[PDB]
Nucleic acid binder design. Structure first.
Ligand SMILES: Nc1ccn([C@@H]2O[C@H](COP(=O)(O)OP(=O)(O)OP(=O)(O)O)[C@@H](O)[C@@H]2O)c(=O)n1
Ligand SMILES: [Mg+2]
Lengths: 418, 1004, 218
DNA sequence: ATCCTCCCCTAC
DNA sequence: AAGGTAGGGGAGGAT
């Protein structure tokens, strides 16, 4: 009957409503709150659901493909981009839609995300699109803020945003291929535009319209090429010389396409994407086409490196040096490099700064014997070779000597760096 | 002023006082009144920073405060555990206060009273009279106990007074109701300080006619007109109902030491209180020794809930609200909490408690004379029976025939009893005092004087039986021992469980070692594993199996490993096998074994592959000392048991040492209990891990051991299983047995503490000689520290059905081939209380027959399974059509409670509908009988769809109608699976089920 | 509105259909104790004992349960005071006034608030006394409260020392709140925020909240 | 079939 | 105010 008990119930009430977009770190707290709620009142009107997925479709409508007609109203238009869709909730992590998980995003981006959500609390969660390792903020889902102020704040804090258009419409405005072309050319954006969404002033519900065609294409090869720092993307090449855009590796893995086959493609006015109507084969054939020394780094491809002292210094953001003993003095000059050097163990640092995957690299190390003297690795071997069949694991195993060379080097600098 | 302490109790008025009741050597009763304080423990910085000045305070000394929270690290950069040392104060506040930073707040204020004043609850102090102030007649106030209880003298005995009571109420066709049904009889056993016992029964005269009353008086009965004509030295008195109740309250208001009843808090005292209030405007008033309170008798309820969340209540007890320094003790709740029965009823308890074997001395035509002496049974059994024969009306023969006593003659050593019994074809029979053979409901329809006198005999027996049970279970010895062990009032000894009773000695330890235990983080519980359980190697052995059990495993594991919340150095975890090896190599050098013990546990998180706990054994912690205290007490009562020669002394002392076993084991359990002040996840799971390792160590060295011509060869190397040690490891050890012995040892089972070691001999005398030799060598050469094992028994004709279900014949370590083995049943349907009495009889018969055929050895073809299966079907069909077995053989008992998810459970439904309609109310901790009853107009059913729809609860007057029968399908199916699972034939067993039941059988 | 015949005063009970499936036990139970109960002066008079039975239970969400009616001046209606001159109702109205702002009123009656059913656990007491008939109503009080519990979602009890074991008396779990009775020392009734807690619990149970201010009459 | 869940009670 | 895990056998259900 206390104010403390009222607060705990309101916390359960708020989190019970705020589900399906805040599943990063919330279920354990939810379970605690409902167990308290039942313990102190002997009954609670919840089912203690723990398998909540991520789904924000209740804020949107179905995709409109037909040339429909909505003439009156004040609308804000946004050029929805092609790419994977993520959300970012209040005090939570970045989560992808459809399959709830956690993702690592740049710290500068996450900080700016917090700043706009701390500046005003009328936003339930932000919306982001990911394509070619570029993060763009699109449309914040809110109760008290129109889709205007988040764009002004996001730009000032340093997030990428589309150019949005505002118009009050009274004249007949029939939706068709002609209007779609006029609208999309009016935003002055550079990223691939997959559809246009609009919101009516006074209504929170989103609607999206998508005018597209189909194309019948024949794939001849799939190549992998660099976009960033050891980050590569696939590019599907047809016999005509045209390219079919792919956003990530998962799309080709699940679609089960092969070279020298016919596929359906979704055609847009400026680009086209593979249309969606056994795992080892598709991963190995794409790699074989571009070369054996590639693995699948979760969402992207990455090439095998030639790691040495020069690469270690480039990733730790310190000056280049020739002797490993020079690292101790080139790290204590600044206060900003230490953040990634002292705060994690040798194993973690050598995995991230050399280009190894997470899940596959642990699998390899958990099937490996080591001979270690004075905390230095001098020999190793494999207990169960059946873990090496995955193309990603074989690629990193065959070059594991590079991990050992750096691993010992990073131990050496810590000995005197502290 | 030499006094012995009898009880402590608290007042509940505007001011709170603690009273002591003690008695002088001469019998005088003295009450001493103490001020009641609230106790707080604060640091010096807090003590001097309190805006409201404290009433009083005394320094506690310089105590070390340790933060005993648990964290895990992924490397060896472990920092020192946060600790401080500061001056502490103990603050006394007449009124409750809230202090921002007060520690040791989990302890009771009564515990502070005892400990911080040096007072033993059951001591025999010689009190300093310059501090006691006389405030009333025989009542003192003491403002300074510290200088009053300074001197204690050797214990001395004192007289005590008792009241045992029982009533009988009119019964028509429903449970007696205070608004309709009068009381017919009230009986007392009145014992005074002089030791003189007065036995009398009061008869309600208003149920008899004028002629019946006139004959009652002329035949030797007193007829009193009012309370002032009562004579307690007359066996029978007739009076009106109002006089019956005025006498009842005159006795209940007296300052007895104990007022003892059986289930009299819910019924006996409740009826008297309510029936008096209805008839007259009179109250039963209790007064405090100093006459500052006066309260009326009003029985109240105390509920016991479970320790989980959505869970409901699982017991209830009723208590008297007296404030006069009297213990109203109720045997019903006491026995239920400390006894194992199918049901906890007065007749069932006596049936098991008061029994002996007697011989037929002289047979007759309508009588059979039995004689019982020290020559027919264990010493003391004939004496216990003879004592209850004084008042007893019926004696039961072989638990089946209820005979009425015709003559009784109590002998100097035994007894002679003449019963009304048919001729029986044997000489030696079991006698016990069990159920009677009367129908009271009919006796209240033809009620007359001869019936009134007949009932009087039963009522005084029930009042005296409470005394015989009071002595039988040694309630006085248990009460005093408990009050000293856990420092609490004598009146509270049996109310509390582990979470409270451990705090007495715990507070003493913290103050003697100068330790404060604090926490700053949130407690999170994870699962962890348990003991090591082996699978049986065989089913039927036919060989002697030696049992070597660790004396007290977990308590000694916690001492050996110094496993306590404040002794943990830390938990190191790894996610990969590269850093795991680096950590292992560093741990071997930073934490040398001579000072640290390394426990390799199973990871708590699924993403970890290793979890290592380091304990520092140099400084002994708090739990090891707590365990040593309880272990020492158990040893002392075990020693006294060795000198107990009577049948009641052995039972009492065996109960005492069992209790301390459980309490010491509870000290372990409270470490894994999330809501315990002692909770420590790492320490609780480390204890179990060390336990498993010791069982594996002992099993390995014994399994494959060979006794040869003057020496024993152990199977493995006798090395320390934890760390490098300086003890010898040679597996060859010299023996003192004849060179002619050539044996081999194997291991067939083992569970958490003991190892079942099989030898290839059948003689039970050589097995004892060899086992005792192994006991010496194992404790001196195999085990390396404070761990010890004991040889307990030779199991013969051991048959195991599953990991935790077996039967055998037990030849104890201290026996030989000329002794009678005990019949042991562990985990099987012979001991389960939720099976039947019909199942038990047949499973014993067929299980024995199977053992005899396999032991003898024939294996003609498939005859063993064929003969058993054919015989079983014959008996099952015979009962189905004959239907001669009474319903009492097919009844199960089950405990009621509300601990169900989805409250519409069939068990709650059955009892709730029962309580709403049947006058008998089933309480939240009560065991009720039920049976599966079906219509009598249906055939043998082979396909069973609904079982829950045949359950009914059996009351005291449950008679089957002509359209009802026993639901044999469920009773027979369960029995058949139990018998046939014993067979080792894969063709005949399956066809058997298809013919008899048509169901899919399950085998283990 | 149906009725049953009673062997003793008031010789009849009138009840709403919603109470029909417990009337059988109420008649048997009352006819066991009325001959004893009616020997003395009671509060209220016998004709007011079963007056809350003329009350639908299908439109109730929260029950406000006392222990017994006023020792004097009882009307049969729990917490009701024709002149608003009883301590219990003063503190009940005062606490909600602090939350809602409604301070200009002549009385406050719980029987007109949407979804509220006030109830006295014991149906009567001895004139001038309290808790005096616990033995007479034991069977009846248990039956009647369970019947209400099956309808309401939130049971709100007043008195931590009196309802501490109320969980033992109910077979159907209910979202129980136990507060302080509006009569004890230290003004502990007005320090609770049970009015808002109830509405929050109702929202969690997908029920309409109670506008407690409907009880004010001016 | 066919496994899963819940429960009652026992061995430690 | 409230000790812990291991395990068997049985009833009902959701496939
Ligand atoms: N309630 C109980 C019971 C057991 N146990 C555990 O089972 C272990 C073995 O049980 P046990 O051999 O019957 O008991 P013991 O300590 O060895 O005593 P002993 O009879 O002198 O050998 C105990 O060491 C643990 O105490 C637990 O946890 N709680
Ligand atoms: Mg043991």
């Amino acid at each position: 009957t206390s104010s403390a008990d009222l607060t705990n119930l309101k916390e359960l009430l708020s989190l019970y409503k705020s589900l399906r977009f805040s599943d990063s770190v919330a279920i354990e707290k939810y379970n605690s709150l409902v167990e308290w709620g039942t313990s102190t009142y002997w009954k609670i009107g919840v089912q203690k659901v723990t398998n909540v997925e991520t789904s924000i479709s209740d804020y949107y409508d179905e995709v409109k493909n037909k040339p429909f007609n909505i003439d009156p109203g004040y609308y804000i238009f946004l050029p929805v981009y092609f790419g994977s869709v993520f959300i970012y909730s209040k005090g939570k992590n970045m989560v992808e839609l459809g399959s709830g998980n956690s993702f690592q995003i740049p710290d500068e981006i996450r900080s700016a995300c917090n700043k706009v959500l701390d500046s005003d609390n009328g936003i339930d969660f932000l919306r982001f699109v990911l394509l070619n390792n570029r993060w763009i903020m699109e449309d914040a889902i809110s109760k008290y803020q129109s889709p205007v102020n988040i764009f002004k704040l996001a730009s000032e804090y340093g997030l990428n945003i589309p150019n949005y258009l505002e118009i009050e419409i009274e004249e007949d405005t029939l939706f068709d291929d002609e209007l779609y072309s006029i609208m999309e050319r009016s935003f002055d954006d550079t990223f691939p535009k997959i559809s246009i969404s609009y919101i009516k002033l006074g209504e929170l519900k989103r609607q999206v319209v998508d005018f597209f065609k189909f194309s019948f294409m024949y794939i001849e090869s799939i190549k992998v090429d660099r976009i960033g720092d050891n980050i590569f993307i696939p590019s599907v090449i047809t016999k005509s010389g045209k390219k079919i855009l792919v956003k990530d590796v998962d799309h080709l893995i699940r679609s089960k396409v092969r070279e020298h086959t016919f596929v359906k493609v979704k055609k847009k006015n400026t680009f086209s994407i593979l249309y969606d109507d056994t795992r080892g084969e598709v991963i190995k054939r794409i790699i074989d086409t571009i070369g054996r020394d590639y693995y699948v780094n979760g969402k992207y491809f990455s090439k095998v490196g030639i790691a040495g002292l020069k690469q270690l210094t480039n990733k730790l953001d310190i000056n280049e040096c020739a002797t490993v003993d020079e690292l101790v003095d080139e790290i204590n000059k600044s206060g900003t490099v230490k953040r990634k050097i002292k705060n994690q163990s040798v194993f973690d640092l050598s995995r991230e700064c050399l280009g190894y995957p997470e899940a596959d690299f642990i699998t390899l190390v958990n099937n490996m014997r080591f001979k270690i003297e004075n905390c230095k690795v001098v020999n190793f071997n494999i207990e169960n070779t059946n873990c090496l069949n995955n193309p990603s694991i074989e690629t990193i195993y065959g070059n594991f000597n590079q991990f050992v060379s750096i691993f010992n080097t990073v131990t050496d600098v810590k000995k005197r760096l502290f | 002023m030499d006094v012995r302490c009898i009880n402590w109790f608290e007042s509940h008025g505007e001011n709170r006082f603690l009273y002591l009741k003690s008695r002088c050597r001469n019998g005088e009763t003295v009450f001493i009144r103490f001020p009641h304080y609230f106790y707080y423990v604060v640091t010096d910085e807090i003590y001097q920073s309190l805006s409201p000045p404290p009433f009083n305070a005394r320094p506690m000394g310089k105590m070390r405060t340790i933060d005993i929270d648990e964290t895990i690290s992924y490397n060896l950069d472990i920092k020192d555990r946060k600790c401080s040392v500061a001056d502490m104060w103990l603050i006394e506040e007449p009124k409750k206060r809230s202090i921002q930073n007060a520690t040791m707040d989990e302890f009771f204020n009564i515990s502070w009273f005892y400990i911080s004043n040096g007072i033993s609850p059951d001591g025999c102090y010689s009190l300093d009279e310059q501090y006691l102030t006389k405030i009333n007649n025989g009542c003192y106030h003491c403002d300074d106990p510290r200088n009053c209880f300074a001197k204690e003298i050797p214990r001395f005995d004192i007289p005590r007074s008792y009241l045992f009571l029982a009533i009988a109420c009119h019964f028509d066709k429903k449970f007696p109701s205070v608004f309709i049904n009068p009381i017919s009889h009230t009986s007392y056993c009145y014992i005074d300080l002089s030791g003189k016992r007065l036995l009398f029964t009061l008869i309600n005269e208003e149920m008899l006619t004028e002629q019946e009353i006139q004959e009652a008086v002329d035949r030797g009965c007193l007829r009193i007109q009012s309370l002032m004509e009562m004579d307690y030295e007359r066996e029978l008195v007739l009076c009106s109902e109002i006089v019956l109740l005025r006498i009842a309250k005159q006795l209940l208001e007296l300052t007895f030491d104990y007022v003892v009843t059986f289930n009299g808090h819910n019924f006996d005292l409740r009826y008297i209180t309510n029936r008096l209030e209805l008839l007259t405007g009179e109250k039963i008033i209790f007064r405090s020794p100093d006459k500052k309170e006066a309260v009326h008798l009003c029985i109240y309820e105390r509920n016991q809930s479970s320790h989980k969340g959505v869970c409901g209540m699982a017991n209830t007890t009723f208590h008297v609200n007296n404030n006069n320094g009297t213990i109203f003790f109720d045997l019903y709740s006491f026995i239920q909490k400390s006894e194992k029965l199918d049901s906890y009823k007065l007749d069932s308890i006596s049936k098991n408690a008061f029994s002996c074997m007697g011989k037929v001395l002289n047979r007759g035509v309508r009588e059979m004379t039995f004689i019982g002496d020290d020559t027919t049974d264990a010493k003391g059994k004939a004496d216990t029976f003879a004592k209850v024969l004084t008042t007893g009306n019926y004696v039961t023969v072989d638990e089946d025939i209820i005979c009425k006593v015709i003559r009784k003659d109590i002998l100097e050593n035994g007894f002679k009893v003449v019963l009304s019994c048919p001729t029986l074809p044997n000489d030696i029979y079991k006698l016990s005092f069990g159920k009677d053979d009367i129908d009271l409901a009919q006796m209240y329809k033809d009620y007359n004087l001869n019936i009134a006198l007949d009932m009087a005999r039963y009522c005084i027996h029930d009042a005296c039986l409470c005394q015989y049970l009071w002595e039988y279970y040694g309630v006085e010895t248990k009460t005093d021992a408990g009050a000293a062990t856990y420092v609490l009032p004598q009146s509270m000894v049996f109310e509390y469980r582990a979470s409270t009773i451990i705090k007495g000695p715990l507070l003493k330890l913290l103050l003697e070692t100068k330790t404060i235990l604090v926490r700053s983080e949130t407690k999170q519980k994870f699962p962890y594993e348990g003991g090591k359980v082996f699978a049986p190697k065989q089913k039927m052995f036919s060989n002697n199996v030696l049992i070597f059990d660790y004396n007290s495993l977990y308590p000694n594991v916690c001492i050996f490993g110094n496993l306590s919340p404040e002794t943990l150095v830390g938990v190191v975890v790894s996610t990969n096998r590269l850093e795991e090896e680096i950590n292992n190599q560093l741990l071997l050098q930073k934490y040398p074994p001579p000072r640290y013990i390394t426990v390799h546990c199973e990871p708590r998180l699924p993403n970890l592959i290793s979890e290592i706990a380091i304990f520092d054994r140099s400084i002994e912690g708090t739990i090891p000392r707590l365990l040593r205290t309880f272990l020492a007490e158990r040893a002392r009562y075990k020693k006294m048991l060795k000198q107990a020669t009577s049948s009641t002394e052995k039972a009492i002392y065996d109960s005492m040492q069992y209790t301390y076993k459980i309490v010491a084991n509870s000290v372990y359990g409270l470490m894994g209990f999330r809501n315990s002040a002692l909770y420590s996840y790492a320490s609780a799971k480390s204890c179990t891990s060390i336990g498993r390792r010791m069982i594996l160590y002992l099993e390995s060295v014994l399994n494959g051991a060979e006794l040869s011509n003057g020496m024993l060869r152990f199977a493995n190397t006798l090395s320390n299983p934890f760390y490098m040690d300086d003890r010898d490891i040679n597996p060859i050890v010299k023996t003192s047995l004849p060179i002619d012995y050539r044996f081999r040892f194997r291991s067939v089972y083992g569970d958490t503490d003991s190892v079942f070691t099989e030898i290839d001999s059948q003689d039970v005398d050589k097995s004892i000689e060899i086992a005792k030799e192994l006991e010496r060598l194992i404790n001196s050469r195999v085990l390396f520290n404070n761990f010890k094992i004991e040889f307990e028994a030779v199991y013969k004709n051991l048959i195991m059905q599953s990991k935790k279900k077996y039967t055998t014949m037990k030849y104890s370590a201290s026996s030989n081939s000329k002794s009678v083995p005990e019949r042991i049943n562990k985990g099987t349907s012979e001991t389960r209380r939720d099976v039947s009495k019909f199942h038990k009889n047949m499973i014993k018969t067929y299980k024995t027959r199977l053992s005899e055929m396999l032991s003898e050895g024939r294996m003609n073809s498939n005859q063993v399974c064929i003969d058993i299966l054919r015989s079983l079907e014959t008996d099952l069909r015979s009962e189905f059509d004959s239907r001669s077995s009474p319903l009492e053989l097919f009844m199960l008992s089950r405990m009621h409670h509300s601990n169900y998810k989805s409250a519409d459970n069939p068990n709650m439904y059955l009892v709730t509908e029962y309580n709403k309609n049947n006058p008998e109310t089933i309480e939240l901790g009560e065991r009720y009988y039920f049976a599966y009853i079906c219509p009598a107009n249906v055939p043998w059913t082979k396909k069973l769809v609904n079982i829950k729809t045949y359950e009914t609860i059996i009351d005291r007057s449950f008679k089957l109608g002509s359209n009802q029968r026993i639901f044999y399908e469920v009773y027979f199916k369960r029995l058949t699976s139990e018998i046939v699972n014993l067979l080792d034939n894969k063709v005949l067993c399956i066809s058997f089920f298809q013919r008899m039941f048509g169901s899919r059988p399950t085998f283990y | 509105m149906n009725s049953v015949t009673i062997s003793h005063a008031p010789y009849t009970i009138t009840y709403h259909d919603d109470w029909e499936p417990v009337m059988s036990q109420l008649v048997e139970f009352y006819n066991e104790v009325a001959s004893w109960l009616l020997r003395d002066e009671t509060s209220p008079i016998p004709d007011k004992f079963f007056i809350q039975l003329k009350q639908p239970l299908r439109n109730k969400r929260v029950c406000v349960c006392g222990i017994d009616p006023y020792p004097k001046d009882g009307t049969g209606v729990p917490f009701e005071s024709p002149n608003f001159t009883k301590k219990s109702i003063k503190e009940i109205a005062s606490s909600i006034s602090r939350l809602t702002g409604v301070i200009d009123y002549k009385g406050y009656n719980l029987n007109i608030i949407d979804g509220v059913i006030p109830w006295n656990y014991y149906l009567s007491c001895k004139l001038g006394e309290t808790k005096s008939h616990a033995i007479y109503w034991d069977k009846i009080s248990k039956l009647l409260l369970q019947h209400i519990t099956k309808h309401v979602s939130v049971l709100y009890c007043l008195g931590k020392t009196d309802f501490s074991n109320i969980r033992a008396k109910l077979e159907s779990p209910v979202t129980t709140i136990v507060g302080y009775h509006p009569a004890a020392r230290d003004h502990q009734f007005e320090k609770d925020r049970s009015f808002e807690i109830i509405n929050v619990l109702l929202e969690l149970d997908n029920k309409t909240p109670i506008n407690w201010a409907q009880g004010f009459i001016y």
